[PDB]
Design a protein around this ligand. Structure first.
Ligand SMILES: O=c1cc(C(F)(F)F)c2cc3c4c(c2o1)CCCN4CCC3
Ligand SMILES: O=c1cc(C(F)(F)F)c2cc3c4c(c2o1)CCCN4CCC3
Ligand SMILES: O=c1cc(C(F)(F)F)c2cc3c4c(c2o1)CCCN4CCC3
Ligand SMILES: [Cl-]
Ligand SMILES: [Cl-]
Ligand SMILES: [Cl-]
Ligand SMILES: [Cl-]
Ligand SMILES: [Cl-]
Ligand SMILES: [Cl-]
Lengths: 174, 174, 174, 174, 174, 174
């Protein structure tokens, strides 16, 4: 069997591969979100840039998990990547709501894997998640919550004006 | 006849001269648009700057075509330049709509000339248009479409507020 | 319909979306190839680095196609991404053979789309492929062919020695 | 009526618009002159550069007049731009003679507008012309007269030799 | 057969090899032209430098074609190189006329190969010629036409004086 | 006759022209050798670079001889350039053997011309060869002999491994 594998359960190995799939799916979702906002009939550059950046960030998360799988002696296994849940993402508000829902799902998956590692007495795994994923996830969800609140405050009765102002004055553009 | 002319049809030569006229007309149109927005009773500096820049850009397109005519051994022939279609250009939205209509007409003229060059087995002409005009045109029309969408989003029920905000936060002024 | 779309066929729009899928599949394939060579029981860093780089390069190709779809007024549509053809990629030679097969398939897809654009009198599309994809593809396939020849020359009767030497002295590592 | 217009006659406003037309016509004339000398069968780069520069200079004069129209509360009105008087401009001597004739016509138009402003007790107009146009015009006509004299001195009995020498040793080229 | 060759006709491969021969012949012709003007009894350094430079430029064209042959999987085949058409090249005018004749022949060969690539649906070939050869050729023929006109203008009745002046004031010397 | 020619025999003049032909033939041979090693099915970059460099070096030798012909008042005469002896050059060993054979032939030609100059009491010629050709030739043949010995040492029973190692560790690449 593996010459380096030690204290690395089959259960954790499988869960890591599933988590890689989840992160790549999230990256793909953010890629779709970005290009939707880049449409000439949507045209919100700051929103495009926000989600494009998250596409890369989520890809990097998957990359780190895959590197860690190999570091531990596990075998990276790739599966089909489901397309995103939507072809069109509606308003900035709709999109940011979809993003927070996705991020909560990823966070729960992180917490689930952490719990499995704790149950299997796998502290390297637990520390890996703590050091590179849990706090980043909490920070990202807080930022999205901040955005949702500001987008919501701007809806009022002139949605287009508010949508433009949020993109121009909160989101980075360029 | 010409000591350098080779594989350069009379049809292409004439079409290039017509295209120069079209670009100079477009430049003149943008000059008028710019000075309209510079009026004390319109006063939208970013809109003035946008169209002034396009006046120069379209002049440069005509200049390149004229240089290419000479490079190929054709004879630059100038015609009268019709004045712009309007003396007053209305709102930013009206102006950006007129601009996109003009740009589509120029693009179709480019595509028509490309087709003629393809039919006449004139690859230098085809490459000239591809390298210096087709993509610039597509990029400019995309940018105008982006603007139209943002201007439209801002109209709502407070048109003046939206017109000001678009000029201040999207258009370059400074 | 679209405010910017001009001379952009439904056929080309669909083919671009299919081509994006093909490039993302190729990126995913190269991601798998890279992590296989990063395994402690394969351990060929230069080979890992070669394929990791191609993963990013192919992602960038998909990104460019998606940007161009939007520039032309088409609608980016994402589909499921099939997993790679293999979970384990064998020797460097096996992997480089699989890579050249994949690259030839992408090249044929580029040539097919170019032919469609030529038939539809879509010179922007044709120039886009010529300027950013055809030559890069030819250059990459030539490099892989060079590698295959050097890997093959090294097989002889001491395959492990040759596999190590190729990774150490040809491929960039570290 | 205008919120800024003060001491600005309808007569001056109209005359400024006519003068803009004259300057744009002159720019167009110089554009034609430049491209004629850029022909492979004329090939006098210094002469091409001289007239190209004047095309831009005359455009800038029109631009300044248009800015001043708006500064004063007048309305810029554009008219059709007649093509140049000739398609082919003959020798350098013929061209420089045509240029001096054109410049004298512009100068008389400046003097006429100055006289109108003096009659209408419009000192801003008078100072505008004095500060940005009268002396530039006198300086340009003196330079052309200098050139005409040197071109004439060179005609003698070897016109081609003289035409080449003037372009090479007087005119700026590279 | 070739492990990389794709969409590369035998007809194009052969034509590329013929074109390499034509460019090397042109380089050799320019080498002879340069050394003729370097003779103590001709002594026109600027003319020597002009043609020497073109010798290198045409060699570089052949080099690029040969690199492209290999990039595409074709086989470079070299043939005998015919000596130049003349041992002595007469006047600068005679030489520049011979040069423009040679350049037109190369240009027609480029156009012929482009047409073959178009007929064979070989867009890499077509783009290769468009990007690195067609415009360079048009620019070079325009420059020679410019020179021919200036040399012709100087002939008059004092040919030696004009020949010296052209070399000293137009051609670069060092 | 020549205004500068002094102590320059017709025999030496003719022999110099023959020697120019020999050097250009050698350059052409090295050009073919380089592009053979650049093939995707040969792929030895260091070997390609070695012979490409020699192509230029031998061209420079011909250039120097031609400059010297003119310096002495002789007339450069160009002849047809025979194609190389082979279309395919086999192994690195085969190629380096062919190169040393070619270089010995050039060296004998240099020695023959030196002997002719000595017999004709032409010390400028003799010094020209001594200063710019004899030692360069001896140094190049020594380097090739060094290479042949190292290539031969590597053949043993694993020729491919040795051929790769020589290219990677002796020849400059990357
Ligand atoms: O030489 C130049 C430079 C410019 C410029 F771009 F700098 F403004 C230029 C601009 C315009 C011109 C012309 C121009 O001629 C000559 C033909 C008529 N015309 C009408 C449209 C605006
Ligand atoms: O935004 C990015 C950036 C990258 C990267 F190139 F940086 F790795 C990236 C890479 C891959 C991706 C995706 C990626 O999305 C989203 C679609 C699915 N997918 C599978 C193949 C590998
Ligand atoms: O490698 C080089 C470099 C040059 C150069 F451009 F530097 F002069 C070069 C130039 C010429 C050549 C060759 C040359 O081969 C080889 C083929 C025959 N040939 C005849 C025309 C002049
Ligand atoms: Cl599956
Ligand atoms: Cl008319
Ligand atoms: Cl689905
Ligand atoms: Cl009218
Ligand atoms: Cl033969
Ligand atoms: Cl012969």
């Amino acid at each position: 069997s593996s010459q380096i594998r030690q204290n690395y359960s089959t259960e954790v190995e499988a869960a890591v591969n599933r988590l890689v799939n989840l992160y790549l799916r999230a990256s793909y979702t953010y890629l779709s979100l970005g290009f939707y906002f880049d449409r000439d009939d949507v045209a919100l550059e700051g929103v495009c840039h926000f989600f494009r950046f998250l596409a890369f960030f989520k890809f990097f998360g998957a990359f780190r998990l895959l590197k860690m799988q190999n570091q531990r002696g596990g075998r990276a296994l790739f599966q089909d990547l489901q397309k995103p849940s939507q072809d069109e993402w509606g308003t900035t508000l709709d999109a940011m709501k979809a993003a927070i829902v996705l991020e909560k799902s990823l966070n729960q998956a992180l917490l689930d894997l952490h719990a499995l590692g704790s149950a299997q007495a796998d502290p390297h795994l637990c520390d890996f998640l703590e050091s590179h994923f849990l706090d980043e996830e909490v920070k990202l969800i807080k930022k999205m919550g901040d955005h949702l609140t500001n987008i919501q405050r701007l809806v009022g009765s002139q949605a287009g004006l508010g949508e433009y102002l949020f993109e121009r004055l909160t989101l980075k553009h360029d």
